[PDB]
Design a protein around this motif. Structure first.
Motif, PDB file in Angstrom:
ATOM      1  N   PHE A  41     -95.387 -24.390  10.588  1.00 56.35           N
ATOM      2  CA  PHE A  41     -96.454 -23.420  10.328  1.00 56.35           C
ATOM      3  C   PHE A  41     -96.024 -22.431   9.255  1.00 56.35           C
ATOM      4  CE2 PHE A  41     -98.670 -19.386  11.042  1.00 56.35           C
ATOM      5  CZ  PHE A  41     -99.988 -19.792  10.955  1.00 56.35           C
ATOM      6  N   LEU A  42     -94.747 -22.100   9.210  1.00 59.18           N
ATOM      7  CA  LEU A  42     -94.261 -21.173   8.200  1.00 59.18           C
ATOM      8  C   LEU A  42     -93.880 -21.862   6.883  1.00 59.18           C
ATOM      9  CD1 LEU A  42     -92.128 -18.784  10.424  1.00 59.18           C
ATOM     10  CD2 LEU A  42     -94.472 -18.495   9.588  1.00 59.18           C
ATOM     11  N   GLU A  81     -93.204 -26.440  15.649  1.00 58.48           N
ATOM     12  CA  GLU A  81     -94.339 -25.522  15.528  1.00 58.48           C
ATOM     13  C   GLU A  81     -94.062 -24.412  14.517  1.00 58.48           C
ATOM     14  OE1 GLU A  81     -93.204 -26.798  18.417  1.00 58.48           O
ATOM     15  OE2 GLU A  81     -95.014 -27.838  19.129  1.00 58.48           O
ATOM     16  N   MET A  82     -93.006 -23.628  14.757  1.00 57.23           N
ATOM     17  CA  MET A  82     -92.681 -22.550  13.837  1.00 57.23           C
ATOM     18  C   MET A  82     -92.315 -23.110  12.469  1.00 57.23           C
ATOM     19  SD  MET A  82     -89.697 -19.721  14.082  1.00 57.23           S
ATOM     20  CE  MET A  82     -89.754 -18.151  13.299  1.00 57.23           C
ATOM     21  N   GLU A 133    -101.217 -19.614  19.555  1.00 54.42           N
ATOM     22  CA  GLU A 133    -102.237 -20.606  19.243  1.00 54.42           C
ATOM     23  C   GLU A 133    -101.619 -21.927  18.763  1.00 54.42           C
ATOM     24  OE1 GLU A 133    -105.282 -19.151  16.581  1.00 54.42           O
ATOM     25  OE2 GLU A 133    -106.069 -21.200  16.326  1.00 54.42           O
ATOM     26  N   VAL A 134    -100.607 -21.874  17.887  1.00 54.89           N
ATOM     27  CA  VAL A 134     -99.982 -23.097  17.389  1.00 54.89           C
ATOM     28  C   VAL A 134     -99.277 -23.849  18.520  1.00 54.89           C
ATOM     29  CG1 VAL A 134     -98.137 -23.903  15.909  1.00 54.89           C
ATOM     30  CG2 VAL A 134     -99.788 -22.248  15.005  1.00 54.89           C
ATOM     31  N   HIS A 135     -98.542 -23.128  19.372  1.00 57.86           N
ATOM     32  CA  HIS A 135     -97.862 -23.797  20.481  1.00 57.86           C
ATOM     33  C   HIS A 135     -98.814 -24.325  21.538  1.00 57.86           C
ATOM     34  CE1 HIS A 135     -93.511 -23.730  20.149  1.00 57.86           C
ATOM     35  NE2 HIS A 135     -93.628 -22.606  19.461  1.00 57.86           N
ATOM     36  N   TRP A 161     -92.113 -16.709  18.190  1.00 62.14           N
ATOM     37  CA  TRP A 161     -92.203 -18.164  18.374  1.00 62.14           C
ATOM     38  C   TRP A 161     -91.500 -18.649  19.635  1.00 62.14           C
ATOM     39  CZ3 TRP A 161     -95.473 -21.034  15.648  1.00 62.14           C
ATOM     40  CH2 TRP A 161     -96.058 -20.414  14.545  1.00 62.14           C
ATOM     41  N   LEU A 182    -101.793 -25.891  20.849  1.00 57.47           N
ATOM     42  CA  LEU A 182    -102.807 -26.761  20.257  1.00 57.47           C
ATOM     43  C   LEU A 182    -103.211 -27.873  21.210  1.00 57.47           C
ATOM     44  CD1 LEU A 182    -101.358 -27.123  16.705  1.00 57.47           C
ATOM     45  CD2 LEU A 182    -103.358 -25.762  17.365  1.00 57.47           C
ATOM     46  N   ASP A 183    -102.282 -28.305  22.070  1.00 49.56           N
ATOM     47  CA  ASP A 183    -102.545 -29.299  23.099  1.00 49.56           C
ATOM     48  C   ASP A 183    -103.512 -28.803  24.169  1.00 49.56           C
ATOM     49  OD1 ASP A 183    -100.806 -30.972  21.814  1.00 49.56           O
ATOM     50  OD2 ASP A 183     -99.111 -30.529  23.149  1.00 49.56           O
ATOM     51  N   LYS A 201    -103.814 -24.820  11.447  1.00 49.35           N
ATOM     52  CA  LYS A 201    -103.553 -24.698  12.889  1.00 49.35           C
ATOM     53  C   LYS A 201    -104.186 -25.890  13.582  1.00 49.35           C
ATOM     54  CE  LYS A 201    -104.795 -20.220  13.087  1.00 49.35           C
ATOM     55  NZ  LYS A 201    -105.009 -18.892  13.720  1.00 49.35           N
ATOM     56  N   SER A 202    -103.665 -27.068  13.266  1.00 50.79           N
ATOM     57  CA  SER A 202    -104.166 -28.342  13.746  1.00 50.79           C
ATOM     58  C   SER A 202    -102.981 -29.239  14.056  1.00 50.79           C
ATOM     59  CB  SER A 202    -105.096 -29.009  12.715  1.00 50.79           C
ATOM     60  OG  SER A 202    -104.366 -29.563  11.628  1.00 50.79           O
ATOM     61  N   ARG A 203    -103.200 -30.203  14.947  1.00 45.36           N
ATOM     62  CA  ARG A 203    -102.126 -31.130  15.248  1.00 45.36           C
ATOM     63  C   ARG A 203    -101.717 -31.926  14.018  1.00 45.36           C
ATOM     64  NH1 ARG A 203     -98.676 -30.280  17.391  1.00 45.36           N
ATOM     65  NH2 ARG A 203     -99.521 -30.148  19.527  1.00 45.36           N
TER      66      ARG A 203
END
Ligand SMILES: CCNS(=O)(=O)c1ccccc1OC
Ligand SMILES: CCNS(=O)(=O)c1ccccc1OC
Lengths: 300, 237
Positions: A181-182, A177-178, B113-115, B79, B117-118, A167-169
């Motif tokens: 991550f998946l 994103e999805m 949380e992932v969306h 998502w 991150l900025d 969960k990092s850039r």
């Protein structure tokens, strides 16, 4: 065949050399280990009989110099040292062999365990994870923390493993994103393999080194690193077929070698059940799945 | 950490925060096919994003076209929700952005949380409360507008109407949750309670009737009775 002589054994200690170990009594006439196979890194490690706290040890490659052990009564531990005088060293070793005060690295000929556990591990890469450049060998112990652990306190004494964070850039492309991550294939294949490690051998080498520090020293940050590197491959839909086949062999031998009584602390239920039963690679780790089911069916 | 009974008044302090409910994002009817198999037909949904202090309801309408040709829609919905919440925050100026987002369902944590991150200085939190925001589609004007949309759309309402001119945000939120809990347990009775007296009207820009203070007390009492009952009619007590 190389040798690591000991000056003496002033304190009672369990000494390990790779997956072997033996008990040395206080002031027993022990003067080291002979017949060590050349061509592999090795680890020599110690647990004092008084304070089983702090397992510690040294990673080394006999091709990089002549190394010996000497107890330091000020710092209270067995220290590895390099001998630069080549003739002094051959002379010491020859005398100790003559008086037969060295144990023999007790490798069975059929046995490829150590090779299979260290296939991709190189001294040069160990020395960038464990930074102490005046020495050709690397000290590790149970309490050392990882660079990522320190982000969440002495930097000189850290394990500088490659930071993985799902969960990092770095792990997540904007707009994917999805997807990212998946399916972590772009983080595995582009960010880590192509970008940071360069090739899968270097990735496997750090994975194997992390496992071995977890097993031999109970180093928790190393166990976290080993599982993270496993999970990154298992959570990628797209993995080179050669990497998957080699990963299965790698983990098979790690699971085979783990002490049955340490599996409770050293194995992370969530990562393994994901790798073996939910992840993209649930069907790709046949050897590892079979040994895990026959040896640790409780975990699953 | 998690939002719960003990840290309840934190909702009404001066740190901006949004509550995100995703229950009504992916909505389907289930029907039989000519061959006797079962299929789903999606209908329009909405993200329910609420400031509990000011009453702002940012209602992002989710048009059924967003599902066209997509697989695993229940997972996509989480998502998509997180994408739309991140877009709303990014549009907001820095001083108007929320310091916390509380999601009503734990499965929204990792997508949001992932969306976000900025936005490392925005805390994403779950809650231990069983909040009744799913019933927002029992609010006539909400049910009607989400169903009339022909394209994605952002609709705005104050879910507290003008209540804050007379009561505090703690009291307004408590009234909202009671009304919504009632509508969730027995929509028919709840709506009967609210509209029984024809003389009490709903202003064109309001969701709820223009009750006096005294009439709200009666209303709130009736909603409590309903909920206790339905709990009896359900648990035979
Ligand atoms: C903008 C229509 N007025 S409102 O009160 O319903 C509102 C809703 C959402 C956001 C801000 C709002 O007011 C400032
Ligand atoms: C008094 C205005 N309120 S409103 O926002 O509901 C509205 C806006 C524009 C035209 C008609 C309206 O309502 C009947």
């Amino acid at each position: 065949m190389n040798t690591v002589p000991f000056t003496s054994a002033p304190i009672e200690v369990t000494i390990g050399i790779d997956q072997y170990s033996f008990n040395v009594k206080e002031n027993q006439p022990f003067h080291g280990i002979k017949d060590i196979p050349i061509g592999h890194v090795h680890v020599i490690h110690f647990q004092h009989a008084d304070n089983s706290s702090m397992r510690y040890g040294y990673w080394f490659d006999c091709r990089m110099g002549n190394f010996y052990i000497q107890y330091d009564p000020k710092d209270g531990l067995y220290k590895m040292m390099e001998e630069r005088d080549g003739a002094k060293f051959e002379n010491i070793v020859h005398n100790f062999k003559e008086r037969q005060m060295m144990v023999s690295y007790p490798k069975i000929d059929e046995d490829d365990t150590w090779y299979n556990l260290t296939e991709f591990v190189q001294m040069d890469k160990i020395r960038k994870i464990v930074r102490k450049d005046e020495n050709q060998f690397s000290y590790v112990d149970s309490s050392m923390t990882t660079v990522q652990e320190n982000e969440l306190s002495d930097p000189a004494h850290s394990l500088n493993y490659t930071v993985i964070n799902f969960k990092s850039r770095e792990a997540i492309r904007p707009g994917h994103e999805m997807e990212d991550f998946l399916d972590k294939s772009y983080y595995l294949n582009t960010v880590m393999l192509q970008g940071i490690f360069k090739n899968s051998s270097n990735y496997f080498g750090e994975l194997q080194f992390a496992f071995l520090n977890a097993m031999f020293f109970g180093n928790y940050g190393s166990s976290l690193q080993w599982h993270a590197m496993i999970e990154l491959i298992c959570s990628s839909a797209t993995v080179p077929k050669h990497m998957l086949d080699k990963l299965d062999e790698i983990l098979y031998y790690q699971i085979k070698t783990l002490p049955e009584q340490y599996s409770d602390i050293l194995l992370n239920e969530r990562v393994w059940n994901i790798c073996l039963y939910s992840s993209f690679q649930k069907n790709s780790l046949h050897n590892t799945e079979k040994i895990m089911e026959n040896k640790y069916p409780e975990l699953l | 950490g998690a939002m719960n009974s003990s840290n309840y008044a934190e909702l009404f302090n001066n740190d901006i925060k949004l509550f995100v409910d995703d229950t009504n994002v992916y909505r389907v009817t289930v029907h039989k096919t000519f061959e006797g198999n079962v299929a789903t037909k999606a209908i329009n949904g909405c993200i329910f994003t609420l400031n509990p202090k000011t009453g702002h309801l940012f209602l992002k309408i989710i048009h059924t076209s967003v599902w066209a040709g997509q697989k695993r829609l229940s997972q996509l919905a989480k998502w998509k929700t997180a994408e739309e919440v991140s877009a709303l925050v990014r549009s907001l100026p820095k001083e108007e952005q929320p310091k916390q987002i509380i999601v009503t369902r734990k499965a929204m944590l990792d997508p949001l949380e992932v969306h976000m991150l900025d936005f490392p200085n925005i805390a994403i939190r779950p809650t231990e409360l069983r909040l009744p925001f799913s019933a927002a589609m029992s609010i006539d004007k909400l049910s009607d507008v989400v169903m009339k949309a022909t394209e994605p759309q952002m609709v705005l309402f104050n879910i507290y109407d003008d209540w804050l001119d007379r009561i505090s945000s703690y009291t307004a939120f408590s009234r909202l949750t009671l009304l919504l809990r009632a509508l969730k347990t027995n929509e028919e009775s709840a709506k009967m309670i609210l509209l029984s007296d024809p003389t009490i009207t709903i202003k064109s820009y309001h969701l709820w009737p223009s009750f006096t203070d005294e009439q709200w007390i009666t209303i709130e009492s009736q909603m409590r009775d309903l909920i206790l009952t339905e709990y009896g009619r359900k648990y035979n007590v």
